[PDB]
């Protein structure tokens, strides 16, 4: 396992060194989005959480296609406020209920080290 803790204050530095193969080693789910909500990386442990297979969701829009539960002021609203501000660091609980058994999760959204990319981290609660 790659040793990184969910909610780590420097998680965006640690993950900056990580390819898709190492993202899959994470103890929690991890999705990289660009400013428009497009999935750039999506890890296996999120796959286990949501049941989505990863190679298939890369390049789809998270807010519009993949995850519609998140299209609301409480998820997507925050994400968009953050994109436009150029800074994002928020944690909250949420339920995923699209085409799946309702699963409660802790979400952490953080701006990445690189310019126009954002992390979504996810873990069971």
Dist. CA 115–CA 99, nearest whole Å = 33
User: Closest separation between CB of residue 62 and ligand HC4, Å?
Assistant: 7
Virtual torsion, Cα 39, 67, 106, 80, nearest 10 deg: 70
Nearest to 109 by CA among 25, 17, 29: 29
Of 32 and 70, the one with the shorter C-beta distance to ligand HC4 is 70
Of 56 and 85, the one with the shorter C-beta distance to ligand HC4 is 56
Where does this chain bind ligand HC4 (CB under 6 A)?
Answer: 31, 46, 50, 52, 66-70, 96, 98
Of 52 and 111, the one with the shorter C-beta distance to ligand HC4 is 52
Nearest to 10 by CA among 97, 114, 113, 87: 113
User: Closest separation between CB of residue 64 and ligand HC4, Å?
Assistant: 11
User: Closest separation between CB of residue 83 and ligand HC4, Å?
Assistant: 18
CA-derived radius of gyration, the chain: 13
């Amino acid at each position: 396992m790659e040793h990184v803790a969910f909610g780590s204050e420097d998680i965006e530095n640690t993950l900056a060194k990580m390819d898709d193969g190492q993202l899959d080693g994470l103890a929690f789910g991890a999705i990289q989005l660009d400013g428009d909500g497009n999935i750039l990386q999506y890890n296996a442990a999120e796959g286990d959480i949501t049941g989505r297979d990863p190679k298939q969701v890369i390049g789809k829009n998270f807010f519009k296609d993949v995850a519609p539960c998140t299209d609301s002021p409480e998820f997507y609203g925050k994400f968009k406020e953050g994109v436009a501000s150029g800074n994002l660091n928020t944690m909250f609980e949420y339920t995923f209920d699209y085409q799946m058994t309702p699963t409660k999760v802790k979400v952490h959204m953080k701006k990445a080290l690189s310019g126009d990319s954002y992390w979504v981290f996810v873990k069971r609660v």
